[PDB]
Each structure stands twice: as structure tokens, then as C-alpha cells.
Subunit: 474 residues, 4 copies
Amino acid sequence: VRILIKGGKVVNDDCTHEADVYIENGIIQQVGRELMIPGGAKVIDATGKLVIPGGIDTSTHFHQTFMNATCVDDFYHGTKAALVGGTTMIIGHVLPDKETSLVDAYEKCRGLADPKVCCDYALHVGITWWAPKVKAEMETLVREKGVNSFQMFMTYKDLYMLRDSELYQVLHACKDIGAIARVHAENGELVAEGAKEALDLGITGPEGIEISRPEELEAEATHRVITIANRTHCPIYLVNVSSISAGDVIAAAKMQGKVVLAETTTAHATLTGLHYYHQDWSHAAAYVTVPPLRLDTNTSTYLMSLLANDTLNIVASDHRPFTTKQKAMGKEDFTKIPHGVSGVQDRMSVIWERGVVGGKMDENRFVAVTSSNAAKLLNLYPRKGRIIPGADADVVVWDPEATKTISASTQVQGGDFNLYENMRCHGVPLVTISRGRVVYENGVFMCAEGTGKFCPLRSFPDTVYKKLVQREKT
Amino acid sequence: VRILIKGGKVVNDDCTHEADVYIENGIIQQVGRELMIPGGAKVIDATGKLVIPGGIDTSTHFHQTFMNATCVDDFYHGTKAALVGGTTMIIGHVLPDKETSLVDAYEKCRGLADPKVCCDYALHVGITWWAPKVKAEMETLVREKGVNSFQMFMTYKDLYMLRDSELYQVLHACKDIGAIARVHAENGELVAEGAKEALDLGITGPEGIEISRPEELEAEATHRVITIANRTHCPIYLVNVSSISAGDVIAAAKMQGKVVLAETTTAHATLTGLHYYHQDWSHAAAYVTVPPLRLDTNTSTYLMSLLANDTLNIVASDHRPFTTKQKAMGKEDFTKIPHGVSGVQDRMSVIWERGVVGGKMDENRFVAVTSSNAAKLLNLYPRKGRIIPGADADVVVWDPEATKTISASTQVQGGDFNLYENMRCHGVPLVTISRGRVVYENGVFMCAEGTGKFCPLRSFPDTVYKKLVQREKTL
Amino acid sequence: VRILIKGGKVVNDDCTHEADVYIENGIIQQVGRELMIPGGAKVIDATGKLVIPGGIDTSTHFHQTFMNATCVDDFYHGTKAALVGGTTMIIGHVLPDKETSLVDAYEKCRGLADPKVCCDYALHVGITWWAPKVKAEMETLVREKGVNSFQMFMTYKDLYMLRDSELYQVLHACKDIGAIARVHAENGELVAEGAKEALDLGITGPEGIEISRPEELEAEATHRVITIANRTHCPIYLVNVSSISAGDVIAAAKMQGKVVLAETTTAHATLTGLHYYHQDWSHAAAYVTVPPLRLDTNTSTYLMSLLANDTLNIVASDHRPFTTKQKAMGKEDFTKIPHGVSGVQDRMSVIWERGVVGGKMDENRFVAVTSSNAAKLLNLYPRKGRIIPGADADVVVWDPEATKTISASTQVQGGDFNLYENMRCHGVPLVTISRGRVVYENGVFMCAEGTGKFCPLRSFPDTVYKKLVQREKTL
Amino acid sequence: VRILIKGGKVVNDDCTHEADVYIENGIIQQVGRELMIPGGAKVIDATGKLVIPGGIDTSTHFHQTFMNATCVDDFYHGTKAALVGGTTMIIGHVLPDKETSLVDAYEKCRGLADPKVCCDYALHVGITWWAPKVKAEMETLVREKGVNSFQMFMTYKDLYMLRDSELYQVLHACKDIGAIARVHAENGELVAEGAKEALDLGITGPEGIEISRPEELEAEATHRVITIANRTHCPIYLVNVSSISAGDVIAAAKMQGKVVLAETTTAHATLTGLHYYHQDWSHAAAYVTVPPLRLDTNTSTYLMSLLANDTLNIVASDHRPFTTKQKAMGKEDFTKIPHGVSGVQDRMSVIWERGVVGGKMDENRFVAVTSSNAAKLLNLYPRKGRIIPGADADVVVWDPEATKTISASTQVQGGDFNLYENMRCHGVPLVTISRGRVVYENGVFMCAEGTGKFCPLRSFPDTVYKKLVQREKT
């Protein structure tokens, strides 16, 4: 399959230039103004369009059972939805139950994904308890199974939560093997007490998700894990950053030279918690995730600014849709509403609209936060996240002058609601190319299940570790 | 005993005015310009002097056995040193070991203090472990043993440290019975790992106390306990605040309306951690306390500004002297150097010198940080911490033109070193009056052991709790 | 006139206690529990009530002509409204035009006020231009006309604005004569350009007042004047603090030990700029003042926390009401809407409701922000701002269980709107006493015009300057 | 001239990879692992070396008369010194006297530089007063004379200082033509009063430079000009940032999405004001510049962290050496010591040593702050600041395992002192290539005067303006 993308502007995270792109055998072969190529190529007319690295979504939960509900999208449907939305790689989550094997949970995931994915992928592994067995398994995963990133929780007391002593040991273990420590930082003791107290106060509706875990619980846990990480000399990556208070902690730490990276989600960057107070229970429940969307109307604008200014590095969907019927497990008790929202298909368009069209960042910074920063952290740059010769041919022809009104009735991602219903969004993937084949064009998707491949992720990504390895020389 | 303090300026925390003060039967009877009094009063000449409430020292450790050493000063010597240095009330610590009775520990302390104290006193009670028996003991102490303040530690893993879940319950229990929760906020897991790591690196000298617990450990724990307290709705009182980082956390919280109070020590407000690097091991060890003094040379100036600005409310000595021989338990392993410094006799003069003479605060703010704020928090204001009619006659005649230079060779407090050696002090107590008797005058102390009394401390002090009643209606 | 206030709780800024208060010849003679007094005193029943120092309102504009409109309330009506609302002292503004005499302007004000005031008063003097004649007039005012506070503006380009070089000299001159420098800190060049730009964009409605001067203009000017004051060593007092951004600058400065004080208005501490977008033009215009109320809904809560935390020291009304007809001068051009709102009668009740009932501060902090801090800054403490023997008898019997709802239809202050329309207030003055006479009781005001007196204000108030003496020795 | 650089690692601001580089006719022709090239090329053995974009020094003052002293380095000697130190482009300053023509001052500079420069260069133009004539001249310079950057001062009352009203008009004028506004932000009224007061207090020694302009004067002016710029919608570029207080202002503004960029100097990033108290007057005077080095021992470490974290974008030398004899004009009155220090030759090595070796940033971030960020701001990226095919052949073979001890006795830059005397610095330019010729190798410099060329700088650099032009669409 030989593809010539003609007439567009190549947009990488560093700059934009007019150039044609020639793809063959899964790889970008040439980029330049006037290309000499063999005849017979599929020609895509990208006049007026931007030719960008396909999106890399660093947080997705295809096929995951969580809080007794099973995500509506499996690996085929999730990756299809990602491609239609202009994302060409997904990183999925493995979440072993406490005191169960990390490797078994990883293998189960590999089995669900390998025969089904439409696009390239890799996996983060959840560290949900600690013991010498767990440490050995971390070493195995990094050495043999193409993992370089672990996910920890400071919340979910009695299910997934790690205590300070255990985080210390975890982070020490991650740095010794060159892994990235992702952490969900909310104070789990206080979250547990807050939910019990909210229920006692008769707050049983979805707004309990906000009331029971005010932002100071995030700011506190964020401060604490950054301190633990600085003492262990481990790089720390905060996830689902949701609040001004937490953002301010991260910015203060970075100011002091601490080795801190952070991700937010589309929803936290663009939506407010007023959705929890909607008159329709089902609408309100669809927005329930953690940390929750905050009521302060300035929060989404602030987080967008931080994404533009590199206080936050990366934006992910955190895609974990449930049906209305599954969400309704919590109809009489908000603590049982399963945490999760839809977004894998929405991410690129929503961030283009609120970020770029809204004047918060430019097109190059859009590429950085949707693909290039992630590729770097993943140790896959410039194989991914960059339009250059030699890179993987994961490419999106992006129409910056098309709008689509977003609606659940027209989406292919799972869920009964779309969080961005009726939003007019001015940026559209016109063509999605994955592994050097057109998989989405003229509004039609086509790609066989299992076409995508697992991409092993190598330890010690320079973007983080070159600096750290140098500090420890003294 | 009838006393007339004539010719001075009365300095309270609100303002200064020229007035005489007449005392009888332990109580200030009159304050005013041309007083009509029965003849035969002892007349003290205070012309050129300031008449101030006696110092209230909210943290002292007389007779305490800690880290295998027992504090040099008992309740007689400690309270005498206090009085000579212009402090007329001390609050002592009780520290029951894990799984042992709080009441028994409090009773033992009362037994050691009641016959020995020279000045009024009360006691904080340490909460070092948690269980239903502990909660019942807290209730007993507040309901009938005159306690209204508990001390907890987020550090000293496996000795005194409470875990986060325990601290939540402890703070709920404190606010239910109207107590103040004092907390020593350093991250105890990180302190434990830092010390181990420092030793493994061959850092065994006194500077290990700094290296092993950098200020981020105090800032993190300070932030965490403020957050816990906010969720429990308990007033929270941070102790031994040592760092810019921690002070900034406290200020950011107060900005947000959180119910946060904070104390620092004389040493933290005036000295730097350079002392840990002194060529004499014994000198360095004498400065070892926790959180440690910080190397950042701006630290003491900043903490003094916060005391002036009311980000920090109160200055204490945290008096817990040990000898060089005792300190030498750690000569080859800094983690065994027992934590504690001398200061109960130095506090008023040193804070006067660095605070008032240094231009960071005026004489009225000096009274607030040395007596009045403490009296309010203890529920003893204006009985203490104010020169007014009706108040207890705990009064100091303070000379703001003094010729003193501090030296260990002339102090009466315990310890082989004085942290402030050779410091020139312009403010000193000329006369100390406690319970309406002169106990120190013309450089001579006289007071019989056991003259001081325990002062039961009433729960739900208004200065903290009156606000909290209305605040609760909105939460 | 002899008055006995019996059965109440005395609430000063330090603490609350049950006590009776006996007044004679304009002065509080006794405070205490079972008072021995001559018979035939007027007895006021204060059981269930709080006895507080009367309010001191540090910013009022009675009789002022401003922006081509003349304030609805003169000195009689303004002071009557004050007294009905529980405020017993007002500080008025003098504002001489550029190149005109400060003294003549002060004398004219004294002429308008002396025969009309119902309560005690004093005056701030505006410094709107600079030259040797001005410096000589400042000196005259402080040396013999009882002024100790000057007001300057960093905005109103070409009307009242001082340039940076002039402000430096003005502040040096103020600290030399021991005055307090009040400053309205918005960037006047940017305010001028913002207004022009807003009009050019067709923004002509009242919301222009917000759009044209966003909070960064106040934060920038606030930072700049603090910096100027620090270099001149002059105490600096920020007025009408309106924003989170400005408040954060002030707090950051105080953290650094700068000599900074700050006032806000009732409206800024309680209301938002949403009022500018009201469908009735007249309603929107009634809220127009500078700096404007801010749209950020967290603003008033934050400023109230700063008042509770002492980042802000004092709350004033800034009373300058205009009618709807006067305000309508700007119906087609918001820049001509004269700046000013009603509030002198509302201040005590509104701050009680949002401050004390809201749980942001307690009753004692309420006294500090409404009288005591002002008395200190004015050099009138404890003559005013404290219920003690010897103090002036300016006293309010305050009912903390009141049934009032605020409405313009029942107010006695001027203006067609009341900013707080329909607000339920639990705290109201039952009795107001001024100069030791009852002037308001049983809902009836009675006081003859001119009963109030000018109170000369002495230079170098200790609360600011006593520190500065020692600080100067280190600089 | 045909050059093959073989065996090294190409280090750009985004990543490092092993690759050979082939240069011909002033331009990088190929980059790649195994190159097919015509025979007869000059071969440089870069095994063990890093192949980097040559340094771009955005602030130099060759031939400038300032404070009645004339800089010791002219355009030949300055640019030679730059090349020996691994900097291949310099941006010089034009500073018209108040009420004199901007264009005449630019033309005089062009005349001094064109026949003398050894390396490529361009010029910033000082706006030292304001009137309608000045605005017309700005338009001319941008339209016709290859200027896109103006330098303003908030200090030097009565010589160069602009007042608030004049800055407003200046910044409005700069944004309308797509220029960058560089500003030296110290409060000039307060600086003037502070120097008068210091002298009155009998402080006449070099330490007066600190005492008379404490950091709050910078923080205040920095806050103010950022506010002016935000109101005018003009990009603002702070220069010679020197203090924690000012850095904190810049970081707070960036957090809020304001369009703020900032530069520091080598000396501010690495040295403290204790040098003002040296026992030798001449040593102390050599460090006198503005804003002054600060006494707070944490300042240089903090500013280095900010350079690593992108609070500060760019590091320049601000090279303006004077002799001991010229500095001594201020022997009895510090206010007459002419402001200026040597550094053009030191910059790359000092920042490599303190930045990279000290573990504050990695090698890629070193390239960003020494060349790539500047190229972007200058509208010259990726022509400069990047090793890629098509880029200008301005390249340095950098030895990361060589130390040189810095000493004035061995430098080629001007001045009697070197601020970094005796510093052991572990990174060395082994080879400097400018315009595709070797100009420095085996420790020997060779390049004819006038070989370098003026590089016109085009208006509206995307890195700043693409975002801004979008904001003003609403």
C-alpha cells in the first residue's frame, strides 16, 4: 500500500510547513515539497488540510470491569472509535485485584486485545498492592513484556489504595528499572470518610461525587506523592488532574526542579461539575468520574491554560463508558455509580475546538499534547508523534475548517450519552491512516479486527531519565 | 502581700500606657495614674521600665525521659529558670508510651510537678496510640482533670507516630470535647527512610539531622494535617514550625479560611542549621531538635516576620535540655542524639532582641506572641496575658535598656551550652511577680518549691470555637 | 446625662464578658458586674444583647460633589444614617481639585460639617497634585488642623491621578510628618485606555465599568505602590480592595514584612458584579463604584476571609450615594455614571450577617474590623473602639436576634436603591449612644444637628510607627 | 566546501540520535546513519561527540558605547570569540539616543558589522523615546530593514526610560506589525531615587549596585509591563531576568495564559552578588551589570531551574566587556561604573557545566535554551537551531568529555577579567562550522572578516503570533 498525501501543511509539535507526505510499507518514506515517487499510489488531496501525527491516547479502559460494571467498548469497538476520532494509538490499563498477579492480569489483557485491536497499542500495569512478589513481577514485566509504565492509586481504600510506606517502595522499584510511575492522587482515607459522611447527611444524588471529595483531597495527595517521589528520585506522573489547587501544587513542584509530569482528561479540561446538578439523573451520572469535575466555573479554563503552558503535558480521554442501566446501580446511592465517561472518539476534536479555536494554544502545541509528549514519555518518539521520514505511518488528515456537531446519535464510541452533546467543533479527521493504510475516509471506517499491533515500550525514556541518571552521578 | 508598681508603662497586646499597678492577694486590684492605696505596700520603682504580663511558655519538657535520656531540669529548676527569664506560666508535656494509660501518665506528671513548681502551670497530654480506651481517657481528662489540649506526632514511626486513619479519629474526638489538637507535622515514613539512607551513606555526624529530614517532609505533613483537620472540622495547632515551606503552607491555608493556628520555638525563629556543621561535635549536638534548624539563611528572618504578621501566633521554648554526655549517646550515630534544646530562660529576652529591637514587631505584638495569644488558646484570657484589674498578678517589670550578654556560665536553666552564647540582650526582667509575690528581684531568686499551682484548662476556648459554631451551620 | 446599660455582654475585640456599663458626662465611668451608682440613671435593658463600641466608618463622602453630581447626603443626614446603623464616628473625605489649596478645601469641609454632624468625626485630605505649596499645606494640616491621613489616587488621569515620581515624594512627605498614606490603587493610564477602548467597541452600558478595568489593573497598581512605599519607608494603606488578585498582592507583601495595611468596603466584601448585567439600567448603575465589583463569584467570600484573617484590617462603607437621575448622566456612556454607592447605614448589619452569622469571623473580630483597628490607625484607641472605663461613651446595644429585612423604602440614608435589598439581617442596633447620650432607641432617632464634634487626629500613630522606629535602624 | 561529520550523536531540542551529517554549499544536505556521498569531502571524526546546532546569542553589544565607555570587542573580535565558544549567530543591539533616529542608529550598526562579522547576525532596535516619528520608523524597520524585535527600557530615567503611557503605545505599535517587544524591567524612578539615596548614605563601592536596586524593583516593573502587554495584546519578552521575585511574577503570568517569554544571562543563571564584596575593587566592578547579580545564594540555582522548566526560555551572554581602566570611571562612585560583563565565549560551556553536568536539564533542553527557542522567536527555525536536511550549516562538534579550565589569560573575548575564572567546565567546542565552513578546529581559528551575513528577520513569528492572531478573531 502506497499513499501520497498531497497539498497539505505538515504540523508537528515544533512547527508547521507545507509539504507532501509519501507512505509505503507502514512507514513514512518521504516528506517534502515536490516528491519523486513510483506511479500508482493512492493520492489523497490534503489541500487546505493539516497533516498531523495521529493521536496517542494514554488512558483507555476497553473491556474493563470496574465497580461491578463492564465497559461497553471492547478492544475492536474502542480502537475503531479512536481511529474515527483521529487517534491511532491507545494505551490501555491493566488492573489486577489486590493480592493477585500483575502478570496474569497483563496476559488476560493481551488476550483480549491482540486479536481485536484495529490500531497500535500498549499497556500500563496497575500496582494495586505491595509485597516482594509484586516487585519481582514489575521486573518481569519491564524486562520481558514490553511494559514501562505502572499505574498506582492513592484512593480506593481497601480495593486499590497504596499507603505511604508502600508508595515509597513502589517508586524506588520503578526508578531502578526505568519505569514511569503514574499516580492517581486523591487522599483515599479522606475520600472514604467523606463518602460515608455525605451519605449520612442524606446526600445520595450524583452531586455527592463532588461534595464527598473536595479538591483539597487531590491537592494534598498530589503534594504528598510528589514529595515521596522526590525522596525516591523517581519520576512521577500525575493523572486525571482536575483542580486548580492540584495544578498549582504541580506547578510549584516543577518550579523547584522536581521531576514531575502530569496528564489531564478531555472532560476535566473542558467541562464543569454543574452537570452533576442536571434535572435528569441519567445525564448527571454520565459525568461521574474521579476526581470529579469541579463546580468552580474557572477550573476548565485554568486547566486548558496549564495544558497550553506545559504545566500539564498530555491530554487523554480516560475512556470507560457504561450504559445508563449500569450507571443506575447508583440511583439511590452515588457511591455505587461506576466511575467512567466516554471520550475516546471526542478527544482530538474537543481539544482542537476548546484549545486551538479558543486561542489557548496553537496547532503545534495541540500536536504536542495529543501525540508527541506521549510518544516521548512512552519511548516511542519519533517513531510516533512526528511526521518525518522513517516514522510509523500513523497519520491524520485533519480538516481545520470543518465543523461537526457532536451528538451521541452519530458517534461510534460506546455510551448512551456524549458529554459534548451539541457542541459545534471546527476540526475533523477527514482521513485516518494507521500502519500505513487508510482506515477511515469519506466517513466510512474499514479495518479488520486484529490489524493493530502491540508495541513494546522500552525502559528509561530519555525525556525523563537522561536528567535523572545524571543527578545520581552526584 | 501588697505591691505597688509605680512609674512604669503598662504594655498589653493592644496598646501601651503610663500607669501604676496595685496588687493584693494574688490579683491585680487597680491600674491607673494616681492610685489610692493603703499604706505599707512594697513599692517597686518601674520608672523607665515596661510592666508586662508574665510570659506563658506553651511547650516545656521538665523531668521528661526521652530517647533514653532524662531532661536536666525538673519542675523546680525549670520553673525557676522560667521565672528568672520572665515567664510566669508553663505548659508541660505528658507523653504516655504506646498502649499505656494517658491518665496514669498525667497523674504521674501531676505528682512530680505539684510539689515542685514555682509558678502556675498546666499540661498537654500526648496521644501516641488509638483505641476505644484512649478515647475514653481523653474524655476523662477534659471532663475532670483540667486538660484541654492534646499533642500528637506524625513522625517517630513505631514510637509515637499516628497513622492517617488514627489522626482523623483523634481529631474528631478532640473537636467533640472542645480540645485543641497540637500536632508535630513531619512525614514519619519519610523521616524513617531518610535517616536509614543517611546512615547507609555514612552520614553519622549531627548534620544528619538536617540531611535526613529536609523541609519538604514538614511542608507535606503540614499540608496533610491541615486537610485532615478541615475535613473533621477540628481546630489544628501546628508546633515547632521550622521552615519557609511549612510556613507558606500554613499561610495559604489561613488565606482560605481554614481554622489553623501555629507555634514556633525561639530557636527556630532566631538560629540556623549552620550550627550542625560546627567543628566541635558537642556544640553541634546541642542544637539537635526536630524539625531541625534549616540551613537556608533567610529562614529565621521569615519565621520572625510570620510571628509579627500573625501567620504564627505563639512562640514557645520547647525546653528539653540534655547534657553533652547524654547527647554523646549519638556520637557515632546522629539518630541516637536525643532531641532537645535549652531555652526556657532565654525566650523572652531573645524574642525581645530579635523581634522588637530588630524592628520586626513592636512591644505590643511581643506581648501577644509571648503571653496573650497563649492565654486565649488556653482559655485563661484575660486572667492571664493582660495587665488589668481582676487579672492574676503574674507580672514582669521589664527593662528595655538592659546590659545583659547571655552565657551558659551565668544561666540557671539546665544544659552545658546556651544556644544564644554571647548574644547581647537589651531587654531583661528586672522583677518577676508570680501569684502576687515577688520571686525575682535585684538578680536574686526566691520562691519555695510547690508555690505554683496547677490551673485547670476549660474546654471549647472561645477564641477558636465561637467561630466554629456558626461555621458548622454552613458546612 | 447618666446611663446604666444593664444585663448585657460587653464585646470588645479581644474577648466578651458579662458586665454592666455606666456612663456619665460623655465618658464610660465603670464596667463591671454589680455596679454602685447614684440613683436616677437612665437604665437600658441589655439582657440578651451585646454592648459594643460604636462603629468607626473610615470612608464617607457626605456633601461631596464628584463627577458632576453632588452626594445625596449631607453631614446631618449622613451622620444620622450612620448612628441608626450603629456607627458613631465617621471619617470624611476632603478632595481639593488639582492646583487648588488643600487647606481651603479642608476649611470648607469643616464649615459644612461642624454645624451639622450628629456624631464625632474627622477628615482625610486628598492630595491630587504636587508642588512645594502642597508639601507646606500637608505640614500645616498635620501640625495644627488635626489631620493625620492623606488620600491619593493612582487613577483618574488628569483629574486626581499622581504620577509615580509625585507619589514617591508624597509618601516621603507623609512619613516625615507621621501621617498615614491612603491610596486608591488602580493603574490610571490603563484605566484611561480601557475606558476609551470599551466605548470604541460600543460597550456603553454599566458593565463597561468592569470590562474597562479588569482586576489586573488593581493588582499591578497595588504591587507598585507597596514597592514605592517600601522604598520611602512610608506606611501604606490600600483602599477599596476589590479583587482576589489585589488581595493576594497585599498578603504576599505582608508575608515579606512590608508595612502594609488595607481596607475594603461592605459592597466589595459581600456583592458581585453580576449586578452590572441586571435588565434594569437603574439597578445596574446603582452598583457602579471603583474599583468595580468583580464578576468572579468567589471574590466576596475571599475578601471576607481576608478581613477575618487580618490580611484586610478594616471595613468602610465608602458612602457616596447618588440618585437614579444623577446616575443617568451616564445612560448612554458608562464613563459618565458618577462613582458611588449607598452604605453608611448598612455596614454594621451587613458585615454582621455575612461575617459573623456566616461563620467567617466571630463577634470579637467583628468589633476589630468595624471599630477597633480604625481607632488604632486614627490614634484614637482606646478612647474609641473599646468599652472600658475612661473611654468615650460611643456605644451600641446590639441585638443579635433581630428581625430586620433591609429595604430602601425603610432606610434613612440617601439613594433610590439599597444594594442589600431584601437581605435578612440578624444583627441590628437597638440603642445607639453617642457622646454619652442616647440618640437612637425604640426605632426613633433624636439628636440636634451639630452635636457631634471634630476630633483632631494626632500624628505618628503607635500601631504603625512604633515598629518603624526600630526597623529604620536596620535599613 | 563539502564536509562529512562522521560517528557522532545529533542532538536537537527534541531528541538525540546517532547519525552522520553531510554539508555542502552552506547547507546541511543529509543526516542519517550511513550516507552515500561524493568522494573528496573533508571528514570530521565526531566519535564520542555531540553534533549540535550552533549557539544563537540573542544579546550582544559589540562596538557599543554605553555609559561613556566603548565595548572592547568590535564585530570581528566579538564574532570570532562567539565562534570559538560554539555560538554561530549573534543578535546585536542598536541603541539610538533619546529623540534621535532609530533608522540612523541601525544603519550605523550595519556599517560597523557587515564588513567585519565572522558569523551570521541580526539586530534588535532600541526604542528609547516615543513620538509619532518613532512609530513610523518602527514600521520602516520591520518592512524594509529585516528587523522584528525592539528593545525597551523601564529604567535609565532621562536616558532610555519609557513611561507607562509610552510603553502602551509602543506595545500596541509592535503587535500591529508583528514584532517582538523585549523589555528590561526595573522601576526606573525607583532606581534613580535609590542610587541617589545610596550615595547619600556613603555607599560608594560596587556593592551599591545591589543595594540601590533591590529585587522588588524588578518584580514590580516586570508585573507592570506584563499587565501593559496583556492589555495591548502584545507579546512581551522580559530580558536579563535576575531574581526569584521576578521569576515568580513571570511564572504566575504564564500560568494565567498571558503571552510572556523571558530570557536570562549566563551570569545571572550561575553567579551570585558576593562578587560585589570582593576585596579587589577591579574584580567587583567586573561583575557590575543590571539588574545586578543578587546576594541570595539560592538565586542562580533557582534561575537555572526556571531555564530547565521553560519559565525562562533562552539564555544569552549580554556581552559588553570593558577594561579595568574604563570600569574605574566609577572607582569613587558606583553609579558611574559602566554596566557590562564579558561572556560571549563562555556561554555554551558554562551553561553545559552548570545546566547539564549539574543535572538541572538534559542535553536536548541545552540545545533549546542555547539555540532552538531563539531561532523560533527570531523566525529562523528550522533554518537555524536544528540539525536536519535543508538547514543552514551552522554546526558545532561538541565534546561532552573534555574539560577546559576557564581563564582570562587564554580567552579570545575582550575584557581583563573572566567571570568564570578557574571554573572547570566539562563541555568544549571541538569544531565550529559556520555557513558550511570549518572556522575553528584543533584550537585554531580561521575566518576572514566579513564572511558572516546579516539575516533579515521576518515579522509575525508563529511561535508567538499564531495563538495571538487566533485570540483576536474573537
